[PDB]
Swiss-Prot record:
Protein family according to the UniProt entry: Belongs to the heat shock protein 90 family.
Region entry Interaction with NR3C1, spans: 1-209
Name used for this protein in its record: Heat shock protein HSP 90-alpha
Disulfide bonds: none
Annotated ATP binding sites: 36, 78, 97, 123
Shown chain mapped onto the complete sequence: 16 to 224 of 732
Subunit structure: Homodimer. Identified in NR3C1/GCR steroid receptor-chaperone complexes formed at least by NR3C1, HSP90AA1 and a variety of proteins containing TPR repeats such as FKBP4, FKBP5, PPID, PPP5C or STIP1. Forms a complex containing HSP90AA1, TSC1 and TSC2; TSC1 is required to recruit TCS2 to the complex. The closed form interacts (via the middle domain and TPR repeat-binding motif) with co-chaperone TSC1 (via C-terminus). Interacts with TOM34. Interacts with TERT; the interaction, together with PTGES3, is required for correct assembly and stabilization of the TERT holoenzyme complex.
Effect on the protein upon substituting residue 78 to A: Impaired ATP-binding. Strong interaction with HIF1A, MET, KEAP1 and RHOBTB2. Loss of interaction with HSF1 and ERBB2. Los of interaction with TSC1
Organism: Homo sapiens (Human)
Domain observations: The TPR repeat-binding motif mediates interaction with TPR repeat-containing proteins like the co-chaperone STUB1.
Modification after translation: ISGylated.
Role summary: Molecular chaperone that promotes the maturation, structural maintenance and proper regulation of specific target proteins involved for instance in cell cycle control and signal transduction. Undergoes a functional cycle that is linked to its ATPase activity which is essential for its chaperone activity. This cycle probably induces conformational changes in the client proteins, thereby causing their activation. Interacts dynamically with various co-chaperones that modulate its substrate recognition, ATPase cycle and chaperone function.
Length: 209
């Protein structure tokens, strides 16, 4: 049972901008996604202070970066608060309509695409490097869902079964054929060190066979 949804016109327009604009500094997508994980981890961290049972779905708060050269995927996984189905449908928990407007206004006032995170829509920077993005998420007391989109105006949502996560979000980037540098260990390490070096949770870069 796969449900198909239309992006709001403003989000479709943001995605088309990200896909079509000539913009060489694509590596900022990873900072944006790690920032989103850090925010999600802060949320579960705060909820747990008054309700420790919120960590029954896993106490460890951290981020994993998993490259897979066979599948041409880079996956960013966190054990943050996760998203409900309604959050996924509502622009993955973002204020993307107003954020898109602000980002567009900023761009005409001298901003560039690397400032996208300032407008709360950094997730969509994934489309600088990915042809398809799959988001698997599990929030306490909701079921596990998979969102997916290859842009083009629409996204799908379905329940995800097998490979349960205890809690959090996994962003699976199916990379564009010419963006495979982002599976190389030395390149990912460089980007994490350049742009994510003060994130307050462990970031483990997985090794490949
Ligand atoms: Cl909004
Ligand atoms: Mg912030």
């Amino acid at each position: 049972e796969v449900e198909t949804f239309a992006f709001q016109a403003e989000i479709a327009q943001l995605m088309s901008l990200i896909i079509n604009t000539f913009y060489s500094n694509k590596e900022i997508f990873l900072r944006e996604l790690i920032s989103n994980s850090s925010d999600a981890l802060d949320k579960i961290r705060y909820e747990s202070l008054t309700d420790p049972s919120k960590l029954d779905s896993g106490k460890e708060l951290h981020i994993n970066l998993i490259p897979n050269k066979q599948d041409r995927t880079l996956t960013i996984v966190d054990t943050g608060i996760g998203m409900t189905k309604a959050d996924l449908i509502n622009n993955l928990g973002t204020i993307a309509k107003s954020g898109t407007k602000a980002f567009m206004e900023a761009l005409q006032a001298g901003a560039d695409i690397s400032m996208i995170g300032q407008f709360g829509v950094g997730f969509y920077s994934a489309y600088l490097v990915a042809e398809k993005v799959t988001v698997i998420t599990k929030h306490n007391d909701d079921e596990q869902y998979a969102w997916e989109s290859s842009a083009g105006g629409s996204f799908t949502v379905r329940t995800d079964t097998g490979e349960p996560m205890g809690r959090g979000t996994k962003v699976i980037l199916h990379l564009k054929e010419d963006q495979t540098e982002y599976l190389e260990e030395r390149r990912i390490k460089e980007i994490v060190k350049k742009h994510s070096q003060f994130i307050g949770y462990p970031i483990t870069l997985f090794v490949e066979k």
